[PDB]
């Protein structure tokens, strides 16, 4: 939601905005596009707002999660332009028998 | 019926190996090694190497095969039936020769990052110019040490961590630090006494330190984390001995990027308005080379070791590590361009350097043997299948199931070549590291006799007499 | 990690021809205490968005037509179609989620 | 350490055969029928120079209990087929087929020519046909043939190919089906793949693989399970001796020959291929359908048969006659003309078997339960002693759907009567089952052995 | 290559008296020596059976002896042919520790 | 004698040469002469299993005597550098003068190892890994069993 | 077509795909004459034995 040119380096503040709907309901997350067709992953965070991080962004990608605005957040710095990528926003739901995982919707991107 | 009831505690390799009567020798004749100290000389405009870079300064590993000992030939082999049991090798002595003369060599660097000389100083030194950089050269720690174990040598080093991400870095910035265990690798460099690290990533100058060590990483061992390992197959044994002294006090010339508040001074004035760098560095020096501090040419005598393994070789595979600075000295020759003008001209002579090694290694081993159970194939398998593999399990059920087997189409085929250009599949999972090799796996004999070293291991045990 | 994998790229399925992919987890997928298999997929087509295909393989979104129903569990896994069709033409990315980081699949692009 | 099957192997006294009805088997020599718009076909081609291979389906003998079920526990055990003996029918009188290509890459003769020969007109194409390679055979054992033949290696990258290029070269190893390519030895492989031409060799040739056995490797079965039998058997050698006309491949150095002119300047054909002759044939030669026979082979596997199932295999030349017809769409007319005459063909094709057989049984170890476990556990899937005990024992019923709010809809479910596995590949089927029975008194053959046997024949 | 090549296999064997055995202690190594000797022996050959065939594009001939109607012509400077022919039909096996002699 | 041993064999049989054609243009549908170069190549294909038998030797001068006179060259690979028994031959025996790539090469000497025929080239096979304990294992040995029978075994 | 090329010319057209073989009889011999030799039976595939 509303990402665009960044030259690298400095850092990079965006954001991913609900759509008519409860924002505090279920999981959200961060998306990167890595054009091999070989996909890369962003960022996210708990409900309870615990920082999910890979061997990779612990701690990097500083997020800021906003259930008033109903928009997610991020905040990057000192860039890595291997990070370069159209980004995308993603969400989490629960449905709660067979245990195997569906997914609702996701941001502009 | 069922597997076993089974644990992992570790145990005194001894619990089940049983000592056999029975030992061998073998040794290569001898190695020689020869190249450049600074750097290594390749064609320019080629990648490939016209001559490696050799120096003592740079690490040594030693990979040595073993052939299987159920393929092996003894004297009298009726103590075993290959039904229900293995062999395996256990090196009871090891020996290093080395015969070069003893002697020191030396490296430098042509523009060394320096300010000035703070041992002594009479007055306030200039102002930091443009490239102040300059030609100087300097003795590393002398050093001796080896290494013996069934697993690589695990060294470790400083290096850059990736920051924990609050403040945007600025060009200019400390980046922080991370200690890192790696697999020791030939080729890789000694500690000066500057710190086991990578100057290429953390120092952008490359002129802080000479060149053998400034592109790479020196690394050091840590006996904690290899003694640490619960089999000690890293290593079952060592030994070791260094020393170093001070020797000048210089500065790195450059900007200040942390600044000293003044409450730890007061301010000055004129030559004293500005603080002269801060940055100091010893100058390290080793000292006079001893005959008897010498760890070499003379043999060892492993019974007891302090990790549970003792002297088992896994794998027919048993590794050594040597560092060696006695032997350092780097010869300089001359070659004259013109053999003709009777007056010396610089301008005539095309000045070299090039650096002898000598390794030699002469091995003691026991032959022993492994009853098999569950609990056994249980430990194990545990402790690592992979050892089970290249064995025949002795048995996966109780009689040899197959897999549906090989028969091959290969040995020389018809020059396509997806039919090889592939050659062997497995691994040995280290294949990706580098590191020196050889095969003794031709070279056993079953009379110590005739060698030099043996008849220690008589003497040493006394003879009674030579039978079986 | 788990990169999950679909390769060597070059397949297709011609009028009239069930599809042909697979999507292996390098990590076992029989697990202990829950015992249900967690697996994520997508499909990437022109025109829309990069979508998800099938979660548990035995339970499908609405909005998705049965046309894709796989089998097996564990690593690798075996999808059966009566009558493949168009719009099952599509890059079929693959994914887990149970232990996080999420990565993907070395793809179908059937 | 694989051992004989015989090492744990229980035996019966116990014995049942089968024989076919027969078979009725015929079609075209050249190649299949089909509507031409279409691809639907209308008539097979059909050649016994299409790989002749068969396969079997029989009951689970555990399904019938006995008159007597005493002697055994069927659960402490399991209870198995095996091979007693074998016979095919085979009974055409034998026949000569024989073939060719109404075009044809040729120069000519090498043998006889008073002069060098004239130029080349291009597209030179012939119609010729020949013999072939006089061959039976028959081949015996449960698991699937496979035949080895050549293929097109893999050019790596370093020579860039250049347009018309040697294709690197390779031999391939690959499972045999029925209805597949005999060579005449023209080389296993397929040119219509390996062959630019197309205008090369015999049509039905042209289409496909040759293949041929690979004893070897169906020597180097761990289990030798493929066959363990066969025989192998054919004569021939070559009739004439003929030249290809094409562009060049490749030339000769010169310092290997010397220099002509003129007429002699110009380059005498390379291509250079025979004309193969296929031989007499004679009664003699038969080795159909005469009492056929085991005990031990060369495997472990001696009547050891799975899936109540097994494969068979068998070629022959020498029937290889067809008859075509002469339909005149006219008969009116009393005076000939050549116009009234189509022309079609078909092969007909016949056989039978009757193959004799043994139980045996086999109790339970883990040997037992691991060895074919280990070996394959195939088998154990058909038995019911492969454990598994699972977990799992609730759910939810909701009903109904109907009701038009939506609970998401439902189940795909047949999915699996998918058994066999390799059942893509597509060859002939023979199901057998009930046609087993007691006594070869009624049984026209393996009394054969009976009386081999010889044993009393028993009263009345 | 052709199969009209000769082929010549060299097959090397491990010294014995490298290798041992499951029960060695029937002989004393020193005093003697092990050596190996062969019983048996085998040779696969896998191909569909079949003759293959050589010629020469020029080749000194003249014409047919076995029938003509009338004397031939006059020879002239290179009647020589293309013209092809079969070799031989031959099988053979040799097994020794020396090498087979050849004569010409 | 010598670990060394000799097979030589030829077949007619399998003469059989293929040919093959490849398009140089695949789009003109009119046949032409022009578009198909020619290539020729031959199929190849052997295999060797080999039964052994295992022996030992006594020694005595009329031994020893025997076999020096027959090839003495033999002697050489095993003990008795020395007629007798002693042991070998007392120069020096080993050195290795590389590593890694500058120097003349270790190979600049010749190599002092022979077998003379080395002259005389001709196609080579090693087989020293392959050797198996067990024939059952085999296609080939179980006859050698069946020839001389002899079965019985475990379970 | 398919299974050829066309051809043009003298191969313009396609000559007739049928073939057939010329039967050859072989060198008769004295020793393969079945006959004017005596037969003897016992047993026979069918139950009956020489019943007429």
């Known amino acids: 939601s509303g990402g665009g040119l960044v030259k690298p380096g400095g850092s990079l503040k965006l954001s991913c905005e609900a759509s008519?709907?409860?924002?505090?309901?279920?999981?959200m997350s961060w998306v990167r596009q890595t054009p091999e067709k070989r996909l890369e992953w962003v960022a996210s965070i708990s409900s309870g707002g615990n920082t999910h991080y890979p061997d990779s962004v612990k701690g990097r990608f500083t997020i800021s999660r906003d259930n008033a605005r109903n928009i997610l957040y991020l905040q990057m710095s000192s860039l890595r332009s291997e990070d370069t990528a159209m980004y995308y926003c993603?969400?989490?739901?629960?449905?709660?028998?067979?245990?195997?995982?569906?997914?609702?919707?996701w941001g502009q991107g | 019926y069922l597997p076993p009831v089974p644990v992992s505690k570790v145990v005194s390799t001894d619990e089940y190996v049983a000592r056999t009567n029975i030992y061998y020798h073998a040794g290569t004749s001898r190695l020689l090694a020869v190249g450049h100290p600074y750097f290594p000389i390749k064609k320019p405009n080629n990648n490939k190497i016209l001559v490696p870079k050799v120096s003592g300064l740079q690490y040594r590993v030693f990979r040595i095969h073993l052939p299987d000992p159920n393929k092996f030939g003894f004297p009298d082999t009726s103590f075993y039936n290959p039904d229900t049991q293995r062999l395996v090798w256990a090196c009871v002595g090891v020996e290093v020769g080395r015969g070069q003369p003893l002697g020191v060599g030396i490296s430098g660097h042509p523009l060394l990052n320096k300010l000035d000389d703070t041992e002594n100083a009479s007055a306030y030194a200039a102002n930091a110019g443009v490239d102040n950089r300059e030609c100087i050269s300097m003795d590393y720690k002398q050093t001796q040490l080896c290494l013996i174990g069934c697993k690589p040598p695990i060294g470790e080093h400083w290096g850059k961590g990736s920051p924990c991400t609050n403040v945007a870095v600025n060009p200019g910035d400390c980046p922080p630090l991370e200690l890192i265990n790696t697999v020791i690798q030939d080729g890789d460099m000694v500690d000066t006494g500057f710190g086991a690290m990578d100057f290429t990533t953390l120092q952008a100058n490359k002129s802080e330190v000479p060149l053998d060590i400034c592109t790479s990483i020196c690394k050091y061992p840590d006996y904690i984390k290899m003694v640490s390992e619960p089999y000690g197959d890293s290593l079952f044994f060592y030994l070791r001995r260094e020393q170093m002294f001070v020797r000048h006090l210089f500065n790195r010339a450059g900007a200040v990027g942390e600044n000293v508040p003044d409450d730890l001074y007061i301010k000055g004035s004129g030559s004293t308005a500005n603080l002269a760098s801060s940055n100091y560095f010893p100058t390290p020096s080793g000292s006079m080379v001893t005959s008897d501090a010498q760890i070499f040419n003379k043999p060892y005598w492993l019974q007891r070791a302090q990790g549970h393994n003792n002297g088992i070789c896994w794998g027919n595979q048993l590794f050594v590590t040597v560092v060696d600075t006695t032997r350092s000295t780097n010869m300089s020759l001359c070659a004259a361009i013109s053999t003709s003008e009777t007056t010396y001209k610089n301008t005539n002579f095309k000045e070299y350097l090039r650096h002898g090694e000598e390794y030699d290694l002469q091995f003691i081993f026991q032959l022993c043997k492994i009853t098999l159970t569950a609990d056994v194939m249980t430990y194990i398998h545990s402790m690592n299948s992979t050892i089970l593999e290249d064995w025949n399990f002795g048995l996966q059920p109780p009689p040899g199931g197959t897999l549906e087997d090989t028969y091959r189409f290969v040995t020389s085929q018809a020059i396509a070549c997806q039919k090889h250009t592939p050659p062997a599949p497995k691994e040995d999972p280290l294949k990706k590291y580098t590191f020196w090799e050889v095969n003794l796996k031709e070279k056993f004999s079953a009379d110590l006799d005739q060698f030099p070293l043996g008849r220690k291991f008589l003497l040493q045990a006394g003879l009674k007499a030579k039978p079986k | 990690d788990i990169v999950m994998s679909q390769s060597p790229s070059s397949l297709a399925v011609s009028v009239g021809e069930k599809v042909t992919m697979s999507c292996k987890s390098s990590?076992?997928?029989?697990?202990?205490?829950?015992?249900?298999?967690?697996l994520a997929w997508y499909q990437q087509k022109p025109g829309q968005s990069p979508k998800l295909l099938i979660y548990?393989?035995?339970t499908r979104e609405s909005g998705v037509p049965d046309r894709f129903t796989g089998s097996g569990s564990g690593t690798d896994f075996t999808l059966t179609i009566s009558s493949v069709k168009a719009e099952d033409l599509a890059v079929y990315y693959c994914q887990q989620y149970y232990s996080y980081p999420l990565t993907f699949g070395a793809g179908t692009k059937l | 350490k694989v051992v004989s099957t015989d090492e744990y192997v229980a035996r019966t006294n116990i014995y049942y055969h089968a024989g076919t009805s027969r078979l009725l088997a015929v079609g075209h020599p050249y190649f299949p029928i089909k509507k031409p718009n279409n691809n639907k076909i209308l008539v097979p081609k059909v050649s016994g120079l299409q790989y002749r291979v068969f396969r079997i389906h029989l009951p689970d003998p555990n399904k019938f209990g006995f008159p007597d079920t005493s002697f055994y526990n069927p659960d402490t055990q399991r209870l198995v087929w095996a091979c007693v003996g074998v016979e095919v029918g085979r009974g055409q009188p034998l026949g000569v087929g024989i073939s060719g290509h109404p075009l044809l890459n040729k120069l000519d003769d090498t043998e006889n020519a008073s002069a060098y020969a004239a130029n080349a007109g291009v597209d030179n194409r012939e119609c010729i046909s020949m013999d072939y390679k006089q061959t039976q055979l028959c081949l015996i054992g449960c698991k699937p043939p496979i035949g080895e033949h050549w293929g097109k290696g893999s050019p790596c990258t370093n020579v860039a190919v250049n347009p018309g290029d040697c294709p690197p070269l390779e031999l391939i190893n690959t499972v045999i089906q029925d209805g597949d390519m005999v060579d005449t030895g023209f080389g296993a492989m397929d040119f219509t793949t390996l062959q630019a031409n197309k205008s090369e060799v015999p049509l039905d040739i042209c289409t496909s693989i040759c293949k041929y056995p690979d004893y070897i490797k169906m020597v180097s079965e761990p289990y030798g399970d493929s066959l363990f039998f066969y025989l192998r058997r054919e004569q021939m050698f070559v009739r004439h001796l003929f030249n290809r006309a094409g562009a060049v491949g490749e030339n000769v150095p010169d310092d290997l020959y010397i220099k002509g002119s003129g007429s002699t300047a110009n380059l005498a054909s390379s291509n250079y291929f025979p004309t193969p002759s296929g031989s007499m044939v004679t009664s003699d030669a038969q080795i159909f359908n005469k009492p056929y026979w085991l005990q031990r082979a060369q495997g472990h596997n001696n009547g050891i048969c799975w899936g109540n199932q097994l494969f068979v295999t068998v070629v022959d030349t020498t029937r290889s006659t067809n008859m075509s017809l002469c339909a005149a769409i006219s008969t009116s007319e009393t005076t000939y003309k050549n116009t009234n005459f189509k022309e079609y063909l078909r092969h007909g094709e016949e056989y039978d078997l009757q193959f004799i057989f043994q139980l045996c049984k086999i109790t339970l170890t883990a040997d037992v339960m691991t060895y074919i476990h280990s070996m394959n556990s195939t088998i154990l899937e058909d038995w019911n002693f492969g454990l598994q005990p699972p977990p799992g024992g609730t759910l939810e019923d909701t009903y109904r759907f109907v009701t038009s709010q939506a609970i998401a809809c439902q189940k795909h479910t047949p999915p699996a009567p998918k058994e066999d596995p390799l059942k893509k590949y597509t060859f002939w089927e023979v199901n057998l089952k009930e046609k087993f029975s007691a006594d070869l008194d009624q049984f026209p053959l393996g009394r054969k052995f009976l009386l081999q046997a010889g044993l009393k024949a028993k009263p009345k | 290559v052709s199969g009209l090549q000769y082929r010549v296999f060299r097959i090397h064997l491990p010294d014995p008296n490298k290798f041992g055995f499951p029960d060695t202690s029937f002989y004393n190594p020193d005093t003697q020596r092990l050596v190996w000797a062969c019983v048996g022996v085998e040779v696969g050959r896998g191909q569909p059976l079949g003759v293959g065939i050589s010629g020469h594009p020029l080749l000194n001939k003249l014409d047919d002896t076995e029938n003509a109607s009338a004397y031939a012509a006059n020879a002239g400077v290179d009647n020589r042919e293309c013209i092809s022919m079969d070799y031989k039909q031959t099988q053979l096996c040799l097994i020794g520790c020396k090498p087979p002699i050849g004569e010409h | 004698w010598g670990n060394q041993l000799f097979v030589t064999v030829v077949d007619t049989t399998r003469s059989t040469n293929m040919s093959l054609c490849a398009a140089i243009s695949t789009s003109e549908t009119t046949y032409k002469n022009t578009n198909f170069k020619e290539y020729l190549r031959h199929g190849e294909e052997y295999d060797l299993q080999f039964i052994f038998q295992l022996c030992k030797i006594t020694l005595t001068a009329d031994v020893m005597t025997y076999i020096h006179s027959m090839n003495s060259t033999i002697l050489e690979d095993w003990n008795f550098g020395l007629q007798p028994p002693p042991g070998g031959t007392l120069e020096d025996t080993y050195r290795f003068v590389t590593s890694q790539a500058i120097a003349c090469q270790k190979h600049t000497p010749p190599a002092p190892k022979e077998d003379p025929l080395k002259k005389y080239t001709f196609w080579e096979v090693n087989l020293k890994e392959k050797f198996s304990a067990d024939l059952d294992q085999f296609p080939l040995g179980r006859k050698f069993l069946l020839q001389a029978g002899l079965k019985a075994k475990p379970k | 077509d398919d299974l050829y090329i066309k051809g043009s010319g003298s191969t313009a057209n396609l000559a007739s795909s049928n073939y057939f073989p010329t039967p050859s009889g072989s060198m008769v011999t004295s020793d393969a004459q079945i006959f004017n030799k005596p037969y003897w039976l016992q047993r026979a595939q069918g139950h009956n034995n020489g019943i007429c």
């Open positions: 993603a969400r989490g739901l629960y449905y709660g028998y067979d245990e195997g995982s569906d997914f609702d919707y």
């Open positions: 008519g709907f409860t924002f505090s309901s279920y999981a």
């Open positions: 548990w393989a035995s």
């Open positions: 990590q076992s997928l029989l697990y202990s205490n829950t015992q249900k298999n967690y």
